[PDB]
Design a protein around this ligand. Structure first.
Ligand SMILES: C/C=C/[C@H](O)[C@H](C(=O)OC)[C@@H]1C\C=C/C=C/C=C/c2nc(co2)C(=O)O[C@H]([C@@H](C(=O)OC)[C@@H](O)/C=C/C)C\C=C/C=C/C=C/c2nc(co2)C(=O)O1
Ligand SMILES: Nc1nc2c(ncn2[C@@H]2O[C@H](COP(=O)(O)OP(=O)(O)OP(=O)(O)O)[C@@H](O)[C@H]2O)c(=O)[nH]1
Ligand SMILES: Nc1nc2c(ncn2[C@@H]2O[C@H](COP(=O)(O)OP(=O)(O)O)[C@@H](O)[C@H]2O)c(=O)[nH]1
Ligand SMILES: [Ca+2]
Ligand SMILES: [Mg+2]
Ligand SMILES: [Mg+2]
Lengths: 420, 440, 59
């Protein structure tokens, strides 16, 4: 069961690089692709993310994409820059300029076919292809625009495969670019229709965690990515190690997605820098959510919890039952036993034990309402639309994305108000 | 003759197959390489253990079994495990992509790609039988393979083998060890589809086994290995009449005549005793009367329900070990006067008894103490309908909102199959109500 | 004994026919779901062509 990784744009390649650094360390892979670990559990499911080559080399099954070379040139100079496959680098020169239309319809449409060639090359050699996981942002041009274009074109050639995306939501607290509410809404319009599961990485939640919790005066992108890499490692633990629960992308989607459009998850992590009760309590706390949403303002449809480290599984079972009973009001009654828990003995780097939270909560509408509020403020006065219509789009397409995202919030509220 | 073929489907069925055949080998003195020194007839035989084991010219005793899973992880462990020499490679059949806890993929999308090969391999085993008696199908309700593929296979077996008997060992889902939210869906779908193709089904409630392992064996968090080793003892008690022979031995089909009063009422409740740890069995010997009385304690049942609040349609006691009828009759007479044993008015109230003198066996390094005498009670009680009720309620909660239904429709199924399957379950619940009402 | 043979044969027949009906209806439904999925994606390509064409005309 192989997974094909794709990172597009500045944000996508930066968080994608960190993701490969963290899991390569967990699986005992060095920047040269060699294994120097001490446990056979690091290699049992190494084929999910790594291809084996000559000399027992493990090459990440990753595809690096961007409309400008600078961000990807830094990756090749990074710690594990030499571990990636050189032919899997597909970059242009014109760039996107934070223009969704350029990435989706114009400049990215020219580069998309050269990316598909690398996808087919990697996918053809898969013994049993699971699907694809994409890392990108929704507030840029390449990651938001060309990233959503690649999803549609890939789904056309692999309609029976799972499409997973690590989407980074824009926040004015981190980026001052003003056309980001446009790029995010246009991307969400595409993600609702062509992805099976999407992790919402909200930069507003990352900033608030770094500032309020971690006590950081000026959070750098490296600080935010430290939370992203730790989160991405947790939500993929069930895929990378021998496990019973949510061991692959399809079984995860079956347990997490009760309705096809409601596939936007709320990630959480603990500890943010300790006993099992504390881990369980912090894990369900709004201050530990990587999406700026309060779960107590909505109801959980489905939840996946991953505990890592050496601990008492009897205690984990008792505490997970305890939090569901003391917070029953926030779990929909019409989906019995909607909280599944997995335990991996191998903790992350530098931690005795951790906990990763994957929630499908109707409160995620708070995130889509924030972007919708920022969107309509500019669209009702038709501001900055010439950058998009100049590339060929029309106002009709902007209104469709607005209504489709407003429908998503209405549906999240619909099942929040539903009763048994 | 009277051979029985075992089919193990999915992770649950396969991993329980490992426990059962390991236990079988220990009971008959068969080594992991299949050699059986006590068997003096080389290359063949008509002994009682030949109902479950075939013999090669080289003296290997080969299980009459097929293992099927739509992914290779679980069966690969058998191909490289301790008893790997026990099975011919063609008995272990694997795919590449599993059913993802989706009945539709197990019955249709993925299952249809391997169903012909499985039937072909089953045919090879049937051709070795001089008088095939029937099949034993091990599977879960919750998994996409255990539910979807098993239903497809049961349908095909009815076509290729007519009304030849087919018995099920079904793993009823429990939240402590379940791995999918849609297990109620897969349960109702497979029960509806297999109802007319099964002659007798022994349900095993994982929560019941989970509680027994925690309560009686002091296991804080039981694993599948803990549960399966207990399940194998119940399976062994049920099949002991087929694998051994004795004067007081009573064939399983003879119990089956008493257990199934109507075709759809073929779900016996199993209760096993004694389940005790070595530390508590030391210097404590449990008599016939004590283990028999434990059969009427609801905490020892394979399915959680209250037979005190139902009516009996049959009661069978399968003893094994140091047991004589005198002790059995006395224990039963004492129980009749101190238990809530109410029979329906159209059934005789006698208890059917079988005894297999072969003592119980334990897997080395296990949690179960080795005892001199054990018993499995097979009773047909209306109370088992409670298991259908709890499961049907979970189905109704999700299906009222059509939660997760798109995963099944996307694989080619229709809502009509959900409503049709649920209606059959409603009729089944009504069937168990009707059989308990007094006659005019 | 003729009745027992006929009933067993009719059971085998009904089962064989019931199954072939389900497997064919399932095949058509799944293919139809995939064909609709591709048709929608193919309409996004037609729209993308019109968008690039619409840009060519403005200039
Ligand atoms: C002149 C102003 C002087 C001010 O006193 C002062 C300053 O500057 O001195 C120090 C402040 C400095 C404080 C904060 C900066 C904020 C930036 C915001 C920014 N937003 C975009 C670009 O910068 C954007 O969104 O531009 C798009 C292009 C792009 O994104 O590529 C770069 C295009 O390609 C994408 C098309 C879809 C085209 C579409 C719309 C552009 C709107 C202009 C916003 C703006 N605000 C200031 C300056 O400009 C400002 O307030 O500045
Ligand atoms: N008692 C017992 N139950 C098991 C075992 N393995 C899985 N289960 C139960 O079976 C259900 C899940 O079905 P599985 O058998 O694992 O899935 P499957 O049959 O392989 O089907 P797919 O994997 O979806 O293709 C859950 O309710 C589990 O609790 C086991 O070894 N013993
Ligand atoms: N967390 C995080 N967010 C980033 C990073 N780089 C850019 N972003 C976000 O991405 C958005 C801009 O998109 P960007 O990736 O730079 O444009 P692209 O190159 O066209 O994909 C902004 O809202 C940024 O907050 C990063 O390294 N980490
Ligand atoms: Ca012999
Ligand atoms: Mg940028
Ligand atoms: Mg399986």
């Amino acid at each position: 069961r192989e997974i094909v990784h794709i990172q597009a744009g500045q944000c996508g390649n930066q968080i994608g690089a960190k993701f490969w650094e963290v899991i390569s360390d967990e699986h005992g892979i060095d920047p040269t692709g060699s294994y120097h670990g001490d446990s056979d559990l690091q290699l049992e499911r190494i084929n999910v993310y790594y291809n084996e080559a000559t000399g027992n080399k493990y090459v990440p099954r990753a595809i690096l994409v961007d409309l400008e070379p600078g961000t990807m040139d830094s990756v090749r100079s990074g710690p594990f820059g030499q571990i990636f496959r050189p032919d899997n680098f597909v970059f242009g020169q014109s760039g996107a300029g934070n223009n969704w239309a350029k990435g989706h319809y114009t400049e990215g449409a020219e580069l998309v076919d050269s990316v598909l060639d690398v996808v087919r090359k990697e996918s053809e050699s898969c013994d049993c292809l699971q699907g694809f996981q994409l890392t990108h942002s929704l507030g840029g041009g390449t990651g938001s625009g060309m990233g959503t274009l690649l999803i549609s074109k890939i789904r056309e050639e692999y309609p029976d495969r799972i499409m997973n995306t690590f989407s980074v939501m824009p926040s004015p607290k981190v980026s001052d670019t003003v056309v980001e509410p446009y790029n995010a809404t246009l991307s969400v319009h595409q993600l609702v229709e062509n992805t099976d599961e999407t992790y919402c990485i909200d930069n507003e939640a990352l900033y608030d965690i770094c500032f309020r919790t971690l006590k950081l005066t000026t959070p750098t992108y490296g600080d935010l990515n430290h939370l992203v890499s730790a989160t991405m490692s947790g939500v993929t633990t069930c895929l990378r190690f021998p496990g019973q629960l949510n061991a692959d992308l399809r079984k995860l989607a079956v347990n997490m997605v009760p309705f096809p459009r409601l596939h936007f998850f709320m990630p959480g992590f603990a500890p943010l820098t300790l006993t099992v009760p504390e881990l369980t309590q912090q894990m369900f706390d709004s201050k530990n959510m990587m999406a700026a949403c309060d779960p107590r303002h909505g109801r959980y449809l489905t939840v996946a919890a991953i505990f890592r480290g050496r601990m008492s599984m009897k205690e984990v079972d008792e505490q997970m039952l305890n939090v569901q009973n003391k917070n029953s009001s926030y779990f929909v009654e019409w989906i019995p036993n909607n909280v599944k828990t997995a335990v991996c003995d191998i903790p992350p780097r530098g931690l005795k034990m951790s906990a990763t939270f994957i929630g499908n909560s109707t409160a995620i509408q708070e995130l889509f309402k924030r972007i919708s509020e920022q969107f309509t403020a500019m669209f009702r006065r038709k501001a900055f639309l010439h950058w998009y219509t100049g590339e060929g789009m029309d106002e009709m397409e902007f209104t469709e994305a607005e209504s489709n995202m407003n429908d998503l919030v209405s549906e999240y509220q619909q099942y929040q108000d539903a009763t048994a | 003759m009277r051979e029985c073929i075992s089919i193990h489907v999915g992770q649950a069925g396969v991993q329980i197959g490992n426990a059962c055949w390991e236990l079988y080998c220990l009971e008959h003195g068969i080594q992991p390489d299949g050699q059986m020194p006590s068997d003096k007839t080389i290359g063949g035989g008509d002994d009682s253990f030949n109902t479950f084991f075939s013999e090669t010219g080289a003296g290997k005793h080969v299980p009459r079994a097929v293992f099927v899973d739509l992914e290779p992880t679980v069966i690969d462990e058998v191909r490289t495990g301790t008893y790997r020499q026990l099975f011919h490679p063609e008995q272990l059949i694997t795919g590449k992509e599993d059913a993802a806890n989706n009945y539709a993929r197990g019955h249709y999308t993925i299952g249809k790609e391997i169903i012909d090969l499985v039937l072909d391999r089953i045919r090879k085993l049937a051709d070795q039988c001089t008088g095939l008696q029937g099949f034993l199908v091990f599977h879960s309700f919750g998994g996409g393979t255990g539910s979807g593929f098993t239903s497809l296979l049961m349908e095909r077996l009815s076509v290729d083998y007519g009304k030849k008997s087919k018995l099920e060992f079904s793993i009823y889902p429990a939240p402590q060890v379940s791995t999918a939210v849609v297990e109620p869906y897969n349960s109702i779908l497979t029960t509806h589809t297999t109802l007319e193709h099964s002659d007798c089904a022994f349900m095993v409630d994982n929560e019941a086994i989970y509680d027994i392992c925690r309560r009686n064996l002091d296991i804080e968090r039981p694993t599948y290995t803990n549960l399966n080793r207990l399940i194998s003892q119940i399976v062994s008690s049920i099949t002991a009449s087929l694998r051994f022979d004795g004067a007081l031995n009573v064939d399983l089909t003879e119990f089956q005549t008493n257990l199934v009063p109507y075709p759809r009422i073929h779900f016996p409740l199993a209760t096993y005793a004694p389940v005790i740890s070595a530390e508590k069995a030391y210097h404590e010997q449990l008599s016939v009367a004590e283990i028999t009385n434990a059969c009427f304690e609801p905490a020892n049942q394979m399915v959680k329900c209250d037979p005190r609040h139902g009516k009996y349609m049959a009661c069978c006691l399968l003893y094994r070990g140091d047991v004589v009828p005198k002790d059995v009759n006395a224990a039963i007479a004492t129980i009749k006067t101190k238990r809530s044993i109410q029979f329906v008015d159209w059934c005789p109230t006698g208890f059917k008894v079988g005894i297999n003198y072969q003592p119980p066996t334990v897997v080395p390094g296990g949690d179960l103490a080795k005892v001199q005498r054990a018993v499995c009670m097979l009773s047909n009680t209306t109370a088992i309908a409670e298991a259908w009720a709890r499961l049907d309620h979970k189905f109704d909660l999700m299906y009222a909102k059509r939660a997760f239904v798109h995963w099944y429709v996307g694989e080619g199924m229709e809502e009509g199959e959900f409503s049709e399957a649920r209606e059959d379950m409603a009729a089944l619940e009504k069937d168990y109500e009707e059989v308990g009402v007094d006659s005019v | 004994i003729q009745k027992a043979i006929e009933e067993n044969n009719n059971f085998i027949k009904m089962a064989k026919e019931k199954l072939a009906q389900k497997m064919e209806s399932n095949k058509e439904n799944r293919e139809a779901h995939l064909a609709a999925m591709l048709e929608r994606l193919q309409e996004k390509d037609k729209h993308a062509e019109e968008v690039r064409k619409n840009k060519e005309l403005k200039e």
